[PDB]
Write a protein that binds this ligand. Structure first.
Ligand SMILES: CCCCCCCCCCCC(=O)OC[C@H](COP(=O)(O)OCC[N+](C)(C)C)OC(=O)CCCCCCCCCCC
Ligand SMILES: CCCCCCCCCCCC(=O)OC[C@H](COP(=O)(O)OCC[N+](C)(C)C)OC(=O)CCCCCCCCCCC
Ligand SMILES: CCCCCCCCCCCC(=O)OC[C@H](COP(=O)(O)OCC[N+](C)(C)C)OC(=O)CCCCCCCCCCC
Ligand SMILES: CCCCCCCCCCCC(=O)OC[C@H](COP(=O)(O)OCC[N+](C)(C)C)OC(=O)CCCCCCCCCCC
Ligand SMILES: CCCCCCCCCCCC(=O)OC[C@H](COP(=O)(O)OCC[N+](C)(C)C)OC(=O)CCCCCCCCCCC
Ligand SMILES: CCCCCCCCCCCC(=O)OC[C@H](COP(=O)(O)OCC[N+](C)(C)C)OC(=O)CCCCCCCCCCC
Ligand SMILES: CCCCCCCCCCCC(=O)OC[C@H](COP(=O)(O)OCC[N+](C)(C)C)OC(=O)CCCCCCCCCCC
Ligand SMILES: CCCCCCCCCCCC(=O)OC[C@H](COP(=O)(O)OCC[N+](C)(C)C)OC(=O)CCCCCCCCCCC
Ligand SMILES: CCCCCCCCCCCC(=O)OC[C@H](COP(=O)(O)OCC[N+](C)(C)C)OC(=O)CCCCCCCCCCC
Ligand SMILES: CCCCCCCCCCCC(=O)OC[C@H](COP(=O)(O)OCC[N+](C)(C)C)OC(=O)CCCCCCCCCCC
Ligand SMILES: [Cl-]
Ligand SMILES: [Cl-]
Ligand SMILES: [Cl-]
Ligand SMILES: [Cl-]
Ligand SMILES: [Cl-]
Ligand SMILES: [Cl-]
Ligand SMILES: [Cl-]
Ligand code: NA
Ligand code: NA
Ligand code: NA
Ligand code: NA
Ligand code: NA
Ligand code: NA
Lengths: 311, 311, 311, 311, 311
């Protein structure tokens, strides 16, 4: 088999469509997601044209090996897609309608800057390489782009599944390549992060601040050091669900900043004890009373500054 | 091969059945379960009809490639099922009896609202796409739907395996699709959660309340902060077996509420110490004595309210 | 190819044998184990009979596709076995000797009631479905059932590998099914549980009982709360190697009971402190002295009761 | 099929090229990385020469089985590459242009000495074994070596992808082998290690040094022992992301050294308490005051020495 | 195809060789390792003999399906090897030279008695089963046994790769089996265990002994209980990288023994406090002073005894 010949000098247009059946396993650390979808392909092959009136058949069904099929691939997949041809239909003028159901693990970079209040644009890049005989170009049949209503991505809200209709045509290894960008827009369900990580992290921090209403050094050391260790546990827990980033994430910024609050609280607790031992408690009292206001105020203002810089 | 021709204008009815052999690996985080079952298919193909007298055979056995077989797929599977054809039997009138044994990883959403006292309805969606020549519709042969008596799902009780007899017929990519819903009803074995998570979590909370019978601030700080850290460990342990949900789970609600009890216990312990240092112990004694009743009473009432809202 | 015809109305007997080469990966949580073995099959096919005198050959060698082979399957496997045919030998009377080497992941329920002093009977169920032309029945050739001397299952002792010689013949989807039960009896190597989990768990518990020889409330709170947290760590460690069970395991019973001992020790420590603060130390002394005897005595008797109920 | 015959006694030159499409999963512990790329091959086969006038076509397209293709393999791969032939083009003189897209898990040793400020040279070794009829030698077509602009390796910066143009020709099992070295130079994104591991580790260490401004032995024991335990947690966290090395890593050296600082701090805290109990506080005061300067000074100098030895 | 006929009554000798290309993933818990190697096979098949003068060729190249090839298998593999035939060469006298490149996951028991200062002998068992027509025996061609210089096993030192030249010939299911033992000798790189596990474990133990220079019960309880908990963490860490053994490992023996030292240290701390409360400090002082010498002395002697018993 060889590609369909051009009537004049035009490239062969392969109309494409992706219909999502299932979306699952969005792995933040690996920056991958699994997809199960229909891939539809359509092109004109005049060598396959037939007469509807004489044949009595309006459509002809072929096996993939019987006819020429464009070699369509995915750019950003771990391994080649697991595909099963559903149907191949040829109309009298030779218009081929190809349909396959596939499953693939897609590599798509994620921006963690606003985590866990982040939104992502996942990409599925469709590609075709031109042949010596003729140039193959990709197009989007909007009527064949979509998703099943039941499509759910655990821990995420699916906003839209659209295609950038204009392909990216470029030369690669002295041959033309036609690339299409299918975009799956998602937003993270931040809900569970509030009662499980954010509020427990704030509770232990506020518990360390009770040391500002205590003169007992031994109890203060226990309050600030124990809560700091619990904060380290939350820092470790958060970083297990995330890859290492060359930038600060919103959660990472708050987590880092809270260490400074624990460090300064230890200094205050040390300074307070030192002064009391030195028979200067009136002074230790001034620092402790100021700390009661300073710590929540600086914490509130620093969080307003951080939320502003990130959102 | 092509589909069987209609005698009049009727769709081809493909009778289906699923007989469960094995059920395993219900993954809560992934919202998947693995299945090993028999898939039975039945349809009339008049082109395969034969005479029992002249052939001397009552039934004819064929290889899948020798005859036309409907392209039956599963909607909610990770990858295409691993299938092996067991038997293909044709009766004299051309009634085909197809039997295959398959294994598949099924994606089926789970409702964690009542966890670990939750029940689920797992789904296996059977589907067929219509061809140009004729429309293919699915039906349930109740005589061929069931499960082996030994079918066990570790950590779950299997209630029933039934099929919604009426298919969901709809248009997808300008062709008719016929979808059947096979339902596996299961209920979680909550037993082990009681001695391993629920009671240890209650024990540490009740241990923190012993601080209401102590005037020792240093011992009280140790009691409430240490048990809080153990509560954080249980919260982390529980969330490792669960995906992130955009709603509160029953266990999650109790776990979250217990943090408030630890936070208020720290306030009480701080207030008690502060008053005693300020030479107001008679007052601290009133707050501590009230706390001895208030903490278990509010805990009991809040749990009754939560159990009511969730069950 | 079609099945061998019956001389009279008898079922076709397929003689079976399993020879274990390797046993590995017994997964307690998944209730699976991996196996690498020889599967031997033998049946009479008169259509394959030949003359030993005239041919000069005692045996004929065939390729699997050249002759009829019974469709033998495993009931309790995750996916279909990975099999490679080793030999097919036909004797002059038409007796076929089939040999394949296979590997499979077997699902076999485990009874954790006596863990880690438990024994298990792992099952490998062989099955054949009857055809329209004739009924197929399975048999055990004891001469072809066994295991390699070097067969080791890490963390387990292999006792025996035997087969229940009588098949379970039953009707499934209007056809006869012949099922054989191959049993691999194993006993857990409990050794390592003693120095790694049991004795460290007992050491920390006995350390909490030193609080009965101390009047220091602050030190007592530290002794009982710290060791309780270490007990929680051991409880979590034990449950990571086990699935969730709808029953109590022996280890689970001891682990649960030890929480009650920590809870009552906290009550004692609280009662002792309360009385001393109330200027009643003579009374606190009576409770503490009684606790020194009561705690080890009740612990010993409760363990005798538990060991009796479980063994 | 057999190899192309030599015109004289020359080896067959197979021109190669690797164009990276995707780079992912750099596993530090396993010392592997996954790659998705184009492999281009070119060689002259005069037996495939054709006349464009007689055949009509200027270039001929073949299926891999139809013609002789050199057996090109990767040396350092876990399993054989997952490859799909994209195109096989034959020009009139018999010049074959082969193009395949492949995915592979590559084993490439990593030097962790400067971790997490390390750089690596990942290797992809291309190899061909000579046949009896003639010797096969590999060459690099620099025009067909490259990488997609979007190629990203999560947690790493990609510097370059080049090939050592001269093959390593050697004898292996009495036949010639021609090996090419494709090099992917990467540098670790150390950024996240600073707020997540390095600074929290320094904070807890500096917190232990507050014991040098405290006379309270019981608070000092709490300060140094608690922070030491947090340091053990960070040591364990760091070693989970690394394989075991027969050398010290930069991070490993700092982590190890910090233990010595905790050990000497415990000695100081013990010595201080012992002297105070012995009614020698003036002396304990001299040791404690010296420690306030000695500990940060020795820590700074030891880190300058370590940074010098490692960088 | 059938096996080569014997000239007299001799068994067919199949000469073997294994050349290691890659060694990776030595899994201690699973007792497996992955291998990528060349498997060479050689045997005489007179039916393939040819004349060099008449044919004009000195060697003939065949496809595996064209000629008879002995069914060579690996005994101790999880699944069948992933193999690709590289070359099949036939010399004029009919001497066949077979070469394949394979990858396999090998099951090989490990002796952990001296861990982490252990050495292992990994085995790769080659096997052939005899046919009815004739007996097949295996031999080692030492010229074709070896390993690439770059072969590295992360965390291990590779000593040698040799073969036991004499096969183990035995009867299995009334047929002869010929088994060869290929041995890969390795020694563990214990280096990293010293700064990461051994020395931190010793530091925390020595820190618990500072309680013998302290009269403060509350600080002593904190010293011994906190370090014991850190020792439990190291015990858990060590056992995660090891399978459960029916024997004591060297590290396991030291780890277990250290618990006894913590237990006796708690008794000493309790006895010391009890006597001081009972107004007997002169006596408590004698026990504490003796403990300062006894604990390091008994620890040193017990370790000398253990090292002697294990090495
Ligand atoms: C008034 C004293 C202010 C002390 C400020 C401490 C600055 C620490 C800088 C860390 C930089 C990163 C290095 C940690 C040492 C902590 C010393 C605690 C202070 C001692 C109290 C003395 C009371 C007079
Ligand atoms: C300690 C700090 C606690 C966290 C504070 C909330 C972060 C925030 O402000 O989060 C903001 C995000 C919404 O982000 P967005 O609207 O989608 O960004 C797009 C906005 N632009 C386009 C204008 C830039 O979530 C929320 O509305 C937060 C609701 C939950 C609050 C939980 C409080 C505990
Ligand atoms: C009578 C005093 C009541 C204190 C109530 C504390 C409200 C905390 C609100 C947290 C909201 C989330 C922020 C945490 C600070 C804790 C202060 C502890 C009280 C000090 C005791 C003084 C005794 C007179
Ligand atoms: C702290 C709080 C402790 C947990 C309290 C039990 C939760 C509950 O009430 O759980 C209820 C579930 C049963 O739910 P169901 O009957 O199937 O729901 C369907 C009911 N409708 C249809 C009416 C809505 O389990 C039990 O019977 C609990 C038995 C174990 C108790 C363990 C106590 C510790
Ligand atoms: C003589 C007092 C006995 C106290 C028994 C405590 C029973 C706890 C029941 C838990 C049920 C599950 C709920 C936990 C509260 C602990 C209170 C500790 C006792 C206070 C000491 C007073 C000394 C006079
Ligand atoms: C705290 C409690 C500590 C655990 C006590 C041992 C449990 C037990 O008694 O275990 C019993 C099992 C043996 O069980 P079996 O003989 O195979 O059961 C079959 C018996 N029938 C058929 C009569 C029912 O192991 C042992 O012999 C235990 C040896 C190690 C002791 C470690 C002590 C620490
Ligand atoms: C002036 C006393 C210096 C003590 C130096 C301790 C050296 C420890 C060597 C560890 C080698 C690895 C072995 C740990 C014992 C710690 C003893 C603590 C000192 C007691 C204080 C006495 C004050 C007079
Ligand atoms: C406690 C010790 C804290 C760590 C100190 C930094 C290590 C270092 O000095 O790291 C050095 C590396 C750069 O290494 P390079 O230039 O690529 O090596 C090649 C150099 N040659 C060729 C000359 C040998 O990162 C940095 O510039 C460090 C920036 C972040 C500092 C974080 C401080 C906290
Ligand atoms: C002189 C007293 C020696 C005490 C020896 C303790 C032996 C413990 C045996 C455990 C066997 C496993 C069971 C743990 C109880 C610990 C008691 C601590 C001793 C009380 C001090 C009294 C000082 C007069
Ligand atoms: C607490 C105890 C600390 C561990 C003591 C070392 C164990 C040992 O003695 O290890 C011994 C092994 C060597 O064993 P081998 O020579 O290969 O055995 C074969 C010997 N035969 C054939 C004679 C039986 O490593 C070493 O040389 C140890 C070097 C590192 C010491 C780290 C100290 C911390
Ligand atoms: Cl693809
Ligand atoms: Cl499917
Ligand atoms: Cl099977
Ligand atoms: Cl390869
Ligand atoms: Cl094999
Ligand atoms: Cl024998
Ligand atoms: Cl034999
Ligand atoms: Na085609
Ligand atoms: Na068909
Ligand atoms: Na067959
Ligand atoms: Na070829
Ligand atoms: Na304390
Ligand atoms: Na062969």
């Amino acid at each position: 088999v060889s590609p369909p010949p051009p009537i004049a000098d035009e490239p062969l247009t392969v109309n494409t469509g992706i219909y999502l059946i299932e979306s699952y396993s969005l792995d933040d650390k690996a920056e991958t997601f699994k997809v199960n979808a229909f891939l539809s392909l359509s092109w004109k092959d005049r060598r396959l044209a037939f007469d509807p009136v004489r044949s009595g058949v309006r459509v002809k069904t072929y096996e993939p090996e019987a006819i020429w099929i464009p070699e369509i691939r995915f750019v950003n997949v771990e391994n080649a897609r697991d595909a099963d041809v559903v149907d191949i239909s040829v109309s009298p003028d030779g218009t081929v309608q190809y349909l396959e159901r596939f499953s693939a693990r897609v590599l798509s970079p994620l921006d963690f800057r606003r985590y866990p209040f982040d939104s992502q644009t996942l990409h599925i890049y469709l590609i075709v390489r031109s042949v010596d005989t003729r140039n193959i170009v990709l197009a989007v049949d909007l009527e064949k782009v979509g998703k099943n209503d039941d499509v759910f991505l655990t821990g995420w809200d699916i906003e839209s599944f659209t295609a950038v209709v204009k392909p990216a045509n470029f030369a690669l290894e002295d041959r033309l390549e036609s690339k299409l960008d299918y975009q799956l827009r998602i937003s993270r369900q931040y809900f569970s992060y509030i009662p499980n990580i954010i509020l427990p992290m704030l509770f232990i921090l506020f518990i360390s601040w009770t040391a500002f209403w205590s003169t007992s050094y031994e109890a203060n050391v226990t309050l600030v050091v124990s809560t700091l260790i619990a904060h380290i546990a939350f820092n470790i827990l958060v970083c297990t669900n995330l890859p290492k980033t060359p930038y600060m994430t919103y959660t990472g910024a708050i987590i880092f900043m809270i260490y400074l609050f624990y460090f300064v609280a230890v200094i205050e607790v040390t300074v307070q004890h030192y002064l009391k031992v030195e028979s200067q408690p009136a002074r230790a009292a001034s620092i402790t009373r100021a700390s009661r206001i300073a710590f929540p105020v600086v914490f509130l203002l620093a969080n307003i500054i951080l939320a502003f810089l990130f959102f």
